[model samples]
Target chain A: SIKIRDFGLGSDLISLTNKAGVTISFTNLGARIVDWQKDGKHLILGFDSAKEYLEKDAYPGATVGPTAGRIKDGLVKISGKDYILNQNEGPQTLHGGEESIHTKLWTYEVTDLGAEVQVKFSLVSNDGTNGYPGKIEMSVTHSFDDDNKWKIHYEAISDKDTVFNPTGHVYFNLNGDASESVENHGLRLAASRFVPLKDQTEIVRGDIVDIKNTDLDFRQEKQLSNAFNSNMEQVQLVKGIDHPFLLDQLGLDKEQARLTLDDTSISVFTDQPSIVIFTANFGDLGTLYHEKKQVHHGGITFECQVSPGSEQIPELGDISLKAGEKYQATTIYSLHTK
Target chain B: SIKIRDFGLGSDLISLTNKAGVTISFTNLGARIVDWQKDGKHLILGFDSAKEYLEKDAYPGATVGPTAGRIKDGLVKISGKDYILNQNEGPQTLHGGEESIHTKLWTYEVTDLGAEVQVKFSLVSNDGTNGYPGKIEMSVTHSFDDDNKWKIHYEAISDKDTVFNPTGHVYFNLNGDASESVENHGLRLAASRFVPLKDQTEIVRGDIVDIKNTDLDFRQEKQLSNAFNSNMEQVQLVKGIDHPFLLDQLGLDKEQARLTLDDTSISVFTDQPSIVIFTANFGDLGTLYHEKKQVHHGGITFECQVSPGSEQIPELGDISLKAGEKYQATTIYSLHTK
Candidate 1:
């Protein structure tokens, strides 16, 4: 068994020690796992030291936004009038038009489960921010189970018209060094098609294109390295896996098994209709430290949430939450031994 | 003397039988400059053709805003409450927290002197859009002068207490081919010191650090190549000429000179207190077309505006604009023969 504690600092560092020489430290800072070990084996999730990590790029434990993915061109026509949003990802509007909830700080707590940690982040987004048109209050929670499962829950409400697509963008690797690329790790995503982006301006929103024969095909468990460097349509589209794939319609509220990774014996599950897989190929990966050492390659980021660009893809579902309406969703990541 | 005609198509693209073998074109697609020439020698500015240039990766003629520069930690304390902003550039708020005015399309008109393009952008910024306060209305105008000088004017007003730092980000090269790095071009800035970023999160604002003796010393005109690869403190701060240098302070109504490039024999003047210079080292200069032929080597980007993170700089004047009040500033790019 493992015992963890929380001091209520902005960073909720949870420590776990087992007789097997296994010790782990997880912090609410960026929902980051600072250190993990098994029989003297070490694992580190992010680049900077805990202090510099928090100060330099602490996008810590806050729920992602009204739309957690890409929204093509800067302008999206909702009710006839084109609504312009902030361009966060190059010319495309990403992660909820820039001022997303992820960048905010959260208030956290320690649960009865000695090994599990929980954190909640709240924000009241006023009307017309990022062109979303509303006032919203949001909260996100993270907990770890003795069975090695990490569960996440999200809740939100609005006093005006708004949208919600809460998701977590945590980079993970069972081996622990975030610098080592996850390309060699085996991955399986429970999806057959994804929303394809045609021009750089907008997502083509019509049909779900098959992943078969394309680099995007990860339906069956396969090494990420197998297709990452291969010249394929998917790679040509984004140069990397920085897109949202639509899962088979599994209705809201019904938890759907989305993805599984074998290296760390970790699996992810969610109730959302889409999953975004981001290979941290960009950014400063060399700054990541593990066991007092810096890892240079960086891991992969998996984000589960409502279909990205939902505002433009109404057929997927209505992302808008009217005044006095509440928006809620849950995601759970189960980890275990193969 | 060259006589150019205005077709009201956003730029004066006709009637010039280039005895110099240079004919230019402009399109509303990006408000991008298509060509520049001297006696058959053509130089291209901007990115590329509208189709390729308007793609997702192209920033083109977008007007960046709300606060064009940096706001330390993307955080600002308004009325004693600390609010965080979107981390668009690394871990700090940039170009108005991502949804800047630069990404929007503007209205175009052809005048006798040249073409006038006006863009109206508004943000009903909630109590915390990038941690700033209040809603704002911003208007920007881009015009070409009879003497071949390009002029830009910006005006904005806010309904509540807020901060403002609007600027124009235009990439230019008198030699025109974008493939050539600006390293060999002669560069000179009229400023003394600059606001350097600390780990991409905070800014160290103080006295103007001289560029003399340091690789950053562009105080005296020097070949862009002289300092392109130099490992200078300023270069290390942004990987290139990415910081905003403090221009001599002048009242809002007074026009001040900011920068000049000799190789191209071009002078850049602005009424704002600073200008952000970018070497365009990472831009796609190979895609640019001049007279139907593709050109190589990206040009230089001169972003004229208030110092970045203006709200945090006490010495710099306040950027707040009252309701019904107009925020006005001018920038001129004059061309000449050596």
Candidate 2:
């Protein structure tokens, strides 16, 4: 058995090694795969790709905003008048309108085997700027386990009044080899229904559209290629597998098995209510590629989140936090070899 | 002359009339326009339409937050470990993770002519939400004036170490007609230089990219159409005119005029160092139309802001607000018509 240790250093530097041929290093930056090699030869994951991408343009793994979701029509009505928002996204206001959370430098300390990183960002939305209100304060943390699992934790408290939803884009390709398509892997989700989009401005809890009958159904672990029909309705909705799944409600047993990915042998398990599955079809976008010249289109992303568009549907769950109140949630990924 | 009043009530509304032709009613929900013709035919500048949009979404005249500019990669590097962020934009975190300030409901009170609204929204980003630290408190105010202008003010205090930048997004079409395109409307900006993107994660002060020489040169009173050339550089950068203009240093005698429009001849003055300008090209995306079937392509937005993409730039300006310190800024918009 391989033993991994964490020092709780500000820099997320974790080391893993086993008698077999697996040795891995992980960092807090994007939960980035700094090193993943078998006997120090066959590299499974790449190194510091986030730093390279950030040096060019923006990339995944960066913390989002004061509010990391969409506000309907970039306006929030309070009292009777309307407030406008900064057009941070294309046409609407996304990710707290430009003041992204991923850009600040944090404070950190490193322990023998683990590290802890901390950052404090602030917001004061006046009139307009995408029409939200009040001033807010946010703090975020990331932790790793010696059991070959990574944990992400979020906590926030506000002074005035506001809503908050924070999530991360964690891309995983369990194949241990980016040169191969993850489409060959099998997947399963613990969700029955999802929040459907009514239009661009609103959403509703529609039927528990089963993924079993449609191409979106990941209920039974199967190859992604088996569901990659372009004509699929779910694919047409977001141009890809970009929908939010409604996780099974398991109270304090919030530990619902969200997903399982197996690559012929190895497996990964998650205990989250909702997970956003995105096929890293980098081939279509012409951006991501592996050292062996393999396009990144087949990589898989298991994003554990509350829901993608929860702001449009306030009844689903409360992302809003008040003064003196604390908001807490966590997600973990444990990996195993078949 | 029709007299407009700001009674003891907290809200201020404006009413204007010209002997032969026009009568206008303005409210804080927007400078809501009510135009009356000599023939007794009246047209309201999409008041109900704006109201409906406001009611459905709510951010008519509120504030925006956690930070109001761009953070590199959405993952601020603190200590050393990189913290991942929520993807509020396509792949980046935004608005401080969607719950910072823009989504809260405020309190309101109707005055003699208009209404006064207020609300409190708050949040405390844990140690790593997008890699920022500490906790903060922000307060915002939206007030209207008898001069047919809306005033926005913001104040914030922090309990821990944090960074802040707040602004507003207000749309204006100087024709006193919400339905008219601001395309042919003349405009001017009081900035000499602007922040240029160094990839998507960093920003730096660049040459005085003028609207005079390019489509971005709104430095003089020129038609909005005068700069819309598909081949222009700024247009190609972000698909349209979306950038922050660095305003002249604010001083007693050297306060530069931030923005001026010729159609309605409205002038905006701000004490801040920069203002973000966005042309509401609704026509470009085929979204909602303003009054008179006018596409939003002609609508213009003036965002009063500090330099955006600030986390990486140490010399741009100071965004820190201490507990015992007072964070203050004033913006005034005056209307003048030919």
Candidate 3:
């Protein structure tokens, strides 16, 4: 089932429900997933009003793009040419600056995928928007199926050689109530390498290292609380898990990450090179959720995208898209309950 | 009656109640007002846990000081000696930088003033603290009386001449629920002139302007919603009322400001020369308060203190406390109900 209605302030709400009782809602304002419910409970942090989505800082379940993550010094070099982007986050370009797609109204079309309901959101970025070298036509498709699977597919084409990596910034609590801390959830990342972040801002250090003996080693399922309470320098750096982990493999069926709590579990499958794990280190973000203020680690995110700062260090992963080349990537969150 | 309790994370909570049923609570960490209840409703924005206070922005009910507002370029010139302070707010030093007393624990003592219960919080600042040239001892006193009067007294003594101005950043929603917008409240200020702010940061333009025909003229009581819905450049610049209103007069007996909503009203009496009226323009801070994210104009604050930038431009007002000179200021919030 699918429904669309007016969401406040020039935005509309679109909701899709599966036969399995899984429901998800999105807003056109930012092409954001404002609600994700399963088993009679909401599974993600979101707002009741579009106005709240417009003002909140965490990005919540918005599409992060143009180029996901931090671009060191807001500098993007292409073929010996330097293009400076907006340094919205200190000296780095975070989520493509303030003009990123997450804050804009995206046009969309609903499609019947036979077994699934799909909503394709489209947005065009003019050349030099956020200081990117080329104009871009991007589309983000969100689909839900009776299998309790929510999949995100990203596609884009640039008029000139440019960098492009996008991700869905969906924070999941799995506890139904987003105000509850995700620290108790068991997390597993099928990755042996990760990009170490530097400084208090936790930007990529541009060097990938093995996570075997490090605090980031999530190759085996472990309680997220372990990382939250660990005195590991990396864990303490960003206040939680905010580093990008390079997956051991990439495919539609590969399980890159998994999160579980009690009777609920979610497995992540992505065709991207890396994923950034963020433990919602908002600390005391005074915004209220379910009558309580948002706390540190209230929600955890799996930002399935290429490593941040990939443009500066190609060895991390080449995010470059040649002129007229099509860019596509797919990620799926498969939910299950006992 | 006064009571004390552990507030977690090395912080202690102190509560004072008057015969009139008015109660106020403070935390040793930051010497902040965490609660102010009257007629069975909390009158200000606060957190239930000390950990929340340590993590949230917006200052809430904390003491903002050594220098209460923005200092251009983080430069403080004392006796022709230029001192560089921490630029916490972009290139400016705000609320005395990260080492400001608002984030630290303060020693306190309770005193019985016959008809009133008073709590005095004290802290010692060594010379060069936050780039100020002074070895200073400061105390902030909070008192509540049966007459429904909540008084704040600030006293300090310095061994070296330095810039000094402080204010209580208690955000008032009046409606008790901090999540409610304060737009419906009627406000009046004893101010005829205001300092104009420039740029997106809304820093002091260093130029004073007449408010006779401007939207800032709050001399006559007006609904705060007017400012929130205004096209005034100043209001739009910072997203709401954030400018300093230079009071028409200054004295302990002077009625400097007043706020009213429905049957409740509060008159402000202060000896400070200026008051910075911030309409809590946080714009979706994503921090939850009572089941809702903080919104723009969710709360209002009357920051009674010496004018910001007074050290750079003495014409604004002198905030210099000379060596051995004692500084004292009093502000009272007299609450009344129909």
Candidate 4:
């Protein structure tokens, strides 16, 4: 069943419920997933009111785009020319900087495919919006199936050579309690390499580091507390896991990561080359979710985007889009409860 | 009313229920508070099975002694003589080290003072135990009144002069939910100065720093997340507020600190010179509490004791106990619900 209602501030709240009574709500503002409910409890961090999203959200469940992570010095070179973008985090640009794709009111289209309900949100970023060299048309389509699987597909077309790497930022707490920390949740990543971060800043270093015997290694399934409670310099640098894990496989059908809590688990399959796991290091937003503010490590995020710092380190991955080139990336999250 | 029952491993569980229906349970092992409940909900982190405390507890609700916080290089000076203690935290001695007071089995005596119920636990430390030069007789008395006040009185007598500083390590969550993070709890300390920690170690630096303009400042009531979620070097060094706040006043009747969450609040009054505010920076103990594991900052502690590094810097405070002298320290926690 699909329900559409006013979500205040000129946006609409769209909800799609599956046969199992699992409901997920979406709002056109920021093309974000407002809520995901299973048996009447939210599985992700979200606000009760849409108005709170505008004032308190730090990405939460928004589709982050243009560049999902930090860009060194906000400088991008296209065939020997340079474009300096907005720098939000000191000298670096983070999540497309201010007024990026996450804060925009996107146009959406809902479709029913019998077996699945899908909503596609579209946005147009004109040339020089954030010093980019092209008019970029971006669309993020979210699909929910009867099997309790939620899939995200990002597509973009640029009118000129520009940088493009989009990611869906959804902080999930599989215990269905927003205020509960995700320390007990089990996490396994199919990665043995990670993009090590430069000191205090969220920017990535010029080299990729091996995860051998390091706290960043999640090749084996283990409780997230092992990483969050670590005193490792890298772990303490950002408080928790916020670095990009280079995926071992890059196919939509391949399992990239798995997050589990109690009986419910989310298996992620993505075509993106890397996934950044952010443990919600920043605790409260001074706003309520489920009438309580979430604390540090309250939620965990699996952001499957193209490798960050690709502009400065070209060997990491390609995040550049050519004129008239249509780029597409897909990630599937299958929820299972036993 | 009070009840006593077998609590496994040759220990007994002693519980006292106040007139307000608030219940607190104590165990002979470590003379630890096993659980504290109000309206059938736990207000502190404690395991259901008493045996788990033997394996998983990290000084939760236990009396930590000889020296509460870290002692630099495990060195304590009595007169001109030097004593090398058990170094548990690398080059530092923390909470008396391996077979410390927190892990001991103490003998207990219960008393009914008409308006209050009191349990006093006593322990005898033989000379040269963990390399200290004293046969110390230590006692910790816990009392509960009708007004929902829990008072702790610590008294000690040493056969020879030795370094002595004791504290009650109780991780409290006023929300009565162990899994809930205390980041939302508001905290106010009556001190403007704090003991700064050396890099990486729990050992205190030689100097005390002013809390002005720093995240450690909790002079005015502020949510604890302000310190826990900070990027400050001192705050991030230990993951949260694990430093000692030098008390502005040291008397049993003087207010030292206050902790508030929702309608429940606790006012702390102590005679100790300093109180270490540990935000439970270490996340999970891998053991269950209230059937769920507590995350980092899940509970906050106001550990009232002598200033750390007093042996190296006697200017902080005197933590030495001379022979034939009786030492006493008292702390009261008054609970209030709006």
Candidate 5:
């Protein structure tokens, strides 16, 4: 059955629990993934209190997109014209902007539990909200299938030549708590080359480098330690693992990334152009995280999407959407336990 | 549980059956109430096959109105301006004309079970549909509450001046079969007066008559024979009962009508200005209906709405829904058994 309850401070959370003891919770505020559990075990790294999401400023389970990741210098060139966006990540525009959809409310379309429980969170972004030009009708369906797949389907119809690329921001930590590190957990990604970042700006410098002898490679399932076990310039630039792997052309419909902890595993699947493997290097949540400082590599985020800075670098991918055009993308996070 | 199945021939039915065995079925073709059964007993007269709804040209169990009943000469004066509409019944417009919503398809919002199980049928009627100058977005929610109430909620928002008054056209037959007459059924109505019709044209004239002496009176629960047992002009003109009962000012929230059968009873509750009690006069469905001819008064329709022909006679009631405004109405059919 589907249940809804008030999550204090002006937010309502909708939850869908399956017969297999799997539950997924969401809040209208930012349409964030508030909670997810299986057999009494919490899966993702998120705050139980929705107010903490605001107090601590964690976009943990929020919809981190509508052009996710970092956009160099809060600027983009759409059809040869430069457009400036609100920046929140130091110098770059992370996610959409300051007043992104992540911080807004979403209309609940369907909140029901059946053979496959699904909830459609829809929102209509009009005119100017951080000024990226586009009256877009966006719908994101979050569902739980019998096969233990937490599926996310994104759809948007834009009525202006604007930009759109949405992806969820749920930090995964299979070791039970967000305070634990992912150094021992296994990771694998089906990608060859990746976009490297600058040290201070953390911008995608259009430098498409192959993953040979660099910490960016994850062709084989190995430890996250291998990615950080390097003095390589790319590794130290972002401190630890934080790079967008250029998606393998043939792995769209198949498995893309595999994350493991002990006997359990979670696989990522998508049809996007890249898969970002961020290590959550600075997860130092002091007293906010269960009264303990969260160690580095506390959680990992697999952002499956088109290239991060697609709007700026034409070669990255096409982000030039026209008025009658639609932008759609899907990502699946399949969880499995031994 | 709510279940949806395809009936073929461009017809799909959305069904929601409650724990009490109260099932209400709807078809996409006209958002029509194709089927409804109470404890395995069919309570409405409708074609078993939806295709027959098209082949037989019957608006049975469909949503009629938006100007229901009959409008005089297919003309209406709105805001001091005249408008011509399509006429399907002789020279007068009947049920918003030939291409009315009853004949048009409706988009379904949800066909699922929740607390009591409900489905919403919606549609967007643009300007110039039978000369109705408005861009209207309408939604109809058909739900079954635990109290055996088949509740109907109608809402509409328009961006231009228009006339909106919709009603469901379901012929109720508490008796097992529609092939018989409602002679044994007892009827009651919360009305004091009613609009009279012309000898030939069954149009509601501007004259409002008192029901104290007319055969149309049903202030008390009595058999149908009590009304037709006279040479009443209103009854003889239409061959049977067919008149809009003026709603008693005191009965909107409470029971507007309570019909009784041999042992079962049903109550009607609506916030409508009037109720049109139409005894199925010419229900001679020879072949389409249970093989034999359905006798007069096979079933009856209780159309809860604002006064029909109100557009022609503003004195009856206001039916003018203005631009940038909304139209909302509700009706409930609560069934009770002895």
Candidate 6:
């Protein structure tokens, strides 16, 4: 059932509920996924009001684009041309500068595919907006399939050479509530190497070390808290789980990452080269939900993208598509409760 | 009434219950005041687990020191020495560095003072511990009085010239739960001007703007959400309330800041020239309280410190204490409820 309701901020929010009573809510503003529920429980941490996204830094279910992670000093050297970008995080340009795609409004289209509810959002970024040189047309389509799967497909085509990496920055709590810590939740990533951040700016330290024996290793299913509070210098730098684990040569073979809390489980299979496992360490909920403050470990963000800060580490991957080049990526999050 | 309990992390946590049934609980892990309550409801957003704080980017009720906000590029030009501190937030150093005081251990002594319970925590930071040039001896005393006041007294002495600014980073939700945002809560600051941040590094932009006509204006008691989530560039810079408002030259004036939630109110009286009004906009929870994620606006922090990122703004009192000099500050939070 799809219920089209009006938000206080004058936007029509679409609430899509599946046969299993699992619901997902979203609006055009930033193409943010405000809520995702299972059995009346919100699996995604977000707000009810569309205006709340406009006023707070809680990215919640918003999509981060043009660039998703911190760009080292906001300096992107594409083709030896030094382009200065918007510096949002102090001196560094993070998440695509001051006005990233997450804060922008998008044109959306809802679909009534039988057994599935699909919402697609499209936005155009003019050249030189927020310091990125691009007339890029980007679209993200989120499909909540009745077959216990949530699929996200991202596509873009830039008129000019520009960097394009988009991902849903949604925080998920399998416990069905945002108040609970994902620390107790079990997660596993199909990766053996991960990028380390040196500071809170989350700049990649240029080291992709093997996680086979380190706390950064999450190849096995284990509690997120176990690797979160490690004494390792890199882990301590970002205050817990903000690393971009490199996908193996085999790549996301059916399952790139798997997260679970008790009986509820979510397995992510992506086509990207990496996944940034950010255990919402910096979230301070700004919206009201059930009359309580959203605690820390509020939700874990599994941003499926190229290596975070990949702009600097060219060897990792260059996502900048030249004019006429097309960029496409697929991320599938399948949910199962046993 | 007060009850003493032992934490699994091997510390005595004193649970102080006031005459009005208000309670406050905390431990010595960085002198973290984990919880504050009214009636039986926990008003301050926090967790009961001590080790959880060990991991996570959310700096809950712990103390942030040496520095609070962002330092431009982690470059502290102390007497032109060009001292490079630990970079915790990318190129910038925020809330101290990699090993911020919040992550350290402190020795505590609790005293039952008839109608009040006073807990004092003491810790020593050596020179060049986190790349700061200071062998500073710091201590923070938290005294919970039954007379509707939770007072904090901070005193420190540096054997060498070093930066010394400490503030209790506790989040408070007068609604007594973490599910709601503090947007509806009324707040007022006795400040007219505030420092502007450049980019997201939160480095002082070296300009102080008047808030008389801007959303930053909080001279009158109003909803905190009003000033926060503003469309203004400054608010968007750090997302929500992360500005350091300059107190009137007269300073604190018995009521530095005031916050109210319906019938419950908290009045802050301090001697500092500025207070960082952080609306818990960037908090990512690590610990679970009643097994739920504490949402944003979970609590607003009134950090009474020397001007935030004051190193660049010398006009706002320097926190450097030369040898044999004393660094002392006091903040009183008087709670009033109908």
C-alpha lDDT (0 to 100) for residue B329 of candidate 6: 85
Per-candidate iRMSD: 18.6, 18.6, 20.9, 30.6, 15.3, 21.3
TM-score of 5: 0.51
lDDT of 4 by residue, A227-326 (tens): 9889888898988888888888778878788888888888999888889888888755434677776777788889988789887678887788998999
Q: Tell me the spans in candidate 3 whose CA falls farther than 4 Å from its real position.
A: B1-338
Clashing pairs in 5: A67-A165
**Least accurate stretch of 10 residues (summed lDDT) in model 5 chain A?**
A283-292
lDDT score for residue A291 of model 5? 52
Kept native contacts, fraction for each prediction? 0.05, 0.00, 0.00, 0.00, 0.00, 0.00
In the range A1-338, model 6's lDDT, one tens digit per residue, is: 88766543324466887777777877655677777778777677777675566665546677887788877777887667987676778878777765466765455667888898888877666555566766677888878877777788888887678888878888788766656777888888779988877666668777778888887767887788887767888767767777788888544456878888887888888888888887766556423454446666667888888876666677788877787788888888788887
Give lDDT tens digits, candidate 5, residues B13-98: 77777767778787756667877787777777767665577677557878886678888887887788997666778989899776
Task: Score residue A19 of candidate 6 by CA lDDT.
Answer: 78
Better of 2 and 3 by TM-score: 3
Better lDDT candidate (1, 2): 1
DockQ of all models, two decimals each: 0.03, 0.01, 0.01, 0.01, 0.02, 0.01
In the range B46-147, model 4's lDDT, one tens digit per residue, is: 765546786677488889977888888888878787877777788888888655777655656688986799998876665555666666788899988999
Q: What is the lDDT of residue A191 in candidate 5?
A: 87
On DockQ, the candidate that comes out on top is: 1
State the displacement of the C-alpha of residue B171, model 6, in Å, after optimal TM-score superposition: 54
Q: After superposition, how far is residue B154 of candidate 2 from its true place, in Å?
A: 26
The TM-score that candidate 1 achieves is 0.47
User: Tens digits of per-residue lDDT for model 1 on B1-338?
Assistant: 23433322112222222233334444332233444455554443543333344343345445666676666667765545666666677767766665434432222333343233322222234334544555565555555544555566777666565666766556666554544455557777666667665553446454445555676666676677665666876675555667766765554443333233444466777777777776654533345444333222255667777666555566655665555566788777666665
Please give the TM-score for the first chain of candidate 3: 0.96
True-structure Cα RMSD, model 3: 15.7
lDDT of each: 0.56, 0.48, 0.80, 0.80, 0.74, 0.74
Sequence-dependent TM-score of model 4: 0.50
Question: How much is the lDDT of residue A274 in candidate 1?
Answer: 80
Candidate 6 residue runs with Cα over 4 Å from true position: A249-253, A283-290, B1-338
